[PDB]
Amino acid sequence: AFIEWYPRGYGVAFKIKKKIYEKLSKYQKIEVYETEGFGRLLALDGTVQLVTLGERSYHEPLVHPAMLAHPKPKRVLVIGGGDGGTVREVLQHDVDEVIMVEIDEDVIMVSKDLIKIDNGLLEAMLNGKHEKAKLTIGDGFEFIKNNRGFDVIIADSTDPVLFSEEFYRYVYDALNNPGIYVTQAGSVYLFTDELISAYKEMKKVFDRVYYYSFPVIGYASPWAFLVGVKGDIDFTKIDRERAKKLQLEYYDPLMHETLFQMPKYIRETLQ
Amino acid sequence: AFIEWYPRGYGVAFKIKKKIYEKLSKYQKIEVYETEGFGRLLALDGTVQLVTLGERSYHEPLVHPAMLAHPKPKRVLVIGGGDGGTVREVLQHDVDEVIMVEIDEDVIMVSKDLIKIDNGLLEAMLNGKHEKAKLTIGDGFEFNNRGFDVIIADSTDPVLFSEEFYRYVYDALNNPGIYVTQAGSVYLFTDELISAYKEMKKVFDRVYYYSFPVIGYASPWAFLVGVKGDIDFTKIDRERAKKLQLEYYDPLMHETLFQMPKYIRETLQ
Numbered sequence: 320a321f322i323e324w325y326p327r328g329y330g331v332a333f334k335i336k337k338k339i340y341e342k343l344s345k346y347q348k349i350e351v352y353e354t355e356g357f358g359r360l361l362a363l364d365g366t367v368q369l370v371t372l373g374e375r376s377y378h379e380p381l382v383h384p385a386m387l388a389h390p391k392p393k394r395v396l397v398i399g400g401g402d403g404g405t406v407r408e409v410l411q412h413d414v415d416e417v418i419m420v421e422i423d424e425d426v427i428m429v430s431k432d433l434i435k436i437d438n439g440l441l442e443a444m445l446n447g448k449h450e451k452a453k454l455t456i457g458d459g460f461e462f463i464k465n466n467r468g469f470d471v472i473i474a475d476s477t478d479p480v481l482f483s484e485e486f487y488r489y490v491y492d493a494l495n496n497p498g499i500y501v502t503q504a505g506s507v508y509l510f511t512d513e514l515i516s517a518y519k520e521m522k523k524v525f526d527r528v529y530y531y532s533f534p535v536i537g538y539a540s541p542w543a544f545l546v547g548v549k550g551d552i553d554f555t556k557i558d559r560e561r562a563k564k565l566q567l568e569y570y571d572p573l574m575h576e577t578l579f580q581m582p583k584y585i586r587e588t589l590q
Numbered sequence: 591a592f593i594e595w596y597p598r599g600y601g602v603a604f605k606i607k608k609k610i611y612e613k614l615s616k617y618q619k620i621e622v623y624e625t626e627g628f629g630r631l632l633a634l635d636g637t638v639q640l641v642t643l644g645e646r647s648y649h650e651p652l653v654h655p656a657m658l659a660h661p662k663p664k665r666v667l668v669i670g671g672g673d674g675g676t677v678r679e680v681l682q683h684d685v686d687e688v689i690m691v692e693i694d695e696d697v698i699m700v701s702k703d704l705i706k707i708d709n710g711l712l713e714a715m716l717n718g719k720h721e722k723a724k725l726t727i728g729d730g731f732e733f734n735n736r737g738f739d740v741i742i743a744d745s746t747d748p749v750l751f752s753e754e755f756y757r758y759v760y761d762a763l764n765n766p767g768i769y770v771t772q773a774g775s776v777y778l779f780t781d782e783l784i785s786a787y788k789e790m791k792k793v794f795d796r797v798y799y800y801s802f803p804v805i806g807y808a809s810p811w812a813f814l815v816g817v818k819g820d821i822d823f824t825k826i827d828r829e830r831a832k833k834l835q836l837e838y839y840d841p842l843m844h845e846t847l848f849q850m851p852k853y854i855r856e857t858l859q
Contacts, residue, residue, distance in 0.1 A: 320601065322591075327627025328605030332593055356598025376851070508644075508805060532803070534851065536777065540809035571852035580849040582647070582803070583840035 325509040344425035373536030379570035380533035382408035385501040387557035392470040398459030399476035401426030403437025467493035474502035484520040497550035506539040596778040615696035644805030650839035651802035653679035656770040658826035669730030670745035672697030674708025736762040743771035748782035756793040766819035773812040
């Protein structure tokens with residue numbers, strides 16, 4: 320069995336068939352497992368990044384709400400996303416360009432070789448042959464200081480500078496108007512202090528801030544997401560006609576109002 | 591560590607200090623563990639019933655949506671609920687009577703001694719001293735008795751999910767009335783959730799489904815609601831809701847109660 324242990328001794332466990340890879344990269348320990356019932360598991364420093372049977376429960380709620388809330392998202396930035404799932408979801412939409420900035424090249428290599436949820440996308444980006452998606456190997460924090468003009472910015476990073484006020488100010492400045500930033504923001508129940516502090520810093524910067532939660536398979540459930548808006552976007556509304564064209568199994572745009580489920584004590588603290 | 595394993599090799603795990611209790615009753619194996627960070631854990635046949643630090647994440651969404659959806663819930667039945675959490679939540683509301691029917695008396699005894707989420711309620715009920723709450727020992731299916739505004743099934747996972755049972759429940763409900771049951775893991779007991787929804791659709795005037803992040807269970811957890819007469823379960827009494835002390839269920843955001851993965855919603859329709 321593989322177990323990820325969280326604060327206070329809560330654990331997410333998977334029966335495993337085999338450990339099939341391990342490498343200490345320049346930034347983290349990368350490990351891949353074949354699980355019994357959830358396909359392959361990618362772990363970074365012993366934390367679950369995804370399971371191949373269930374990962375859409377993360378990548379769909381991370382990407383599509385923000386993409387559908389924006390009136391016409393054409394230029395998108397993804398920070399992290401070494402496994403390729405996030406950029407794959409972004410490309411369901413008719414964007415002009417998606418830039419991905421990932422610090423750890425070895426996560427990309429391990430994912431394209433052993434995980435393969437990206438369906439050839441990572442290889443195309445590494446070879447510079449993709450018509451819309453471009454890859455930069457680097458620090459998203461530095462990148463956003465020096466690069467700008469995005470309709471949507473998606474932080475698909477590991478657990479927590481990407482949650483600092485300094486970073487959010489650079490993000491806001493780099494966003495178009497209208498613009499939307501979204502980040503995974505940790506376990507609702509177990510990383511609660513980290514969620515609240517991130518929300519606090521975002522509220523200083525953005526014109527609107529929203530929170531939501533979703534049942535992500537492989538993570539301590541449910542997982543939190545935070546949204547920062549530049550300009551006039553009502554994140555409680557989505558483009559239903561664009562939504563109908565998407566291939567979705569987890570996020571339910573026709574029931575978009577339900578996205579905002581959150582335990583009461585956390586709702587109160589954030590407000 | 592304690593682990594409860596679910597279908598497809600998914601596991602909910604708690605680091606534990608010690609196992610402090612184990613007894614085979616006439617019905618099941620009752621165990622109590624001391625966890626490192628979630629208080630005490632009560633298990634029946636290796637399945638988590640509750641952890642004391644977090645159990646309100648189950649008992650609140652089980653009880654309060656149905657109690658607030660009903661226009662005037664005065665008489666309530668709870669099937670199961672040996673730990674006392676469910677009846678405690680029902681008593682937040684101004685009910686006349688709440689009857690609790692639990693088959694296994696040993697769960698009540700272990701809960702009142704070792705778990706203590708009930709704040710003296712179980713003791714009061716055992717001695718017939720509580721003015722509103724009455725305890726009876728027996729099978730909920732067998733339990734004859736009718737005239738309830740709200741019936742809550744706080745029992746084990748998918749006899750209590752059969753069409754035959756649901757007809758007796760429907761006949762036992764007032765008009766207006768409302769039934770609610772916990773309905774298993776959304777992701778891992780999905781076929782069982784769908785088949786319970788199907789049986790309820792054959793009997794009740796309207797069936798609703800929702801989910802909630804319950805601490806200690808494979809999350810999220812499903813709940814099913816059957817309605818007799820004129821109750822719109824998408825609406826709740828906001829003014830009564832503001833007087834409850836709640837940490838988890840958020841009645842002012844009642845519309846979000848109905849979160850459910852898209853593929854599961856589509857299958858249910």
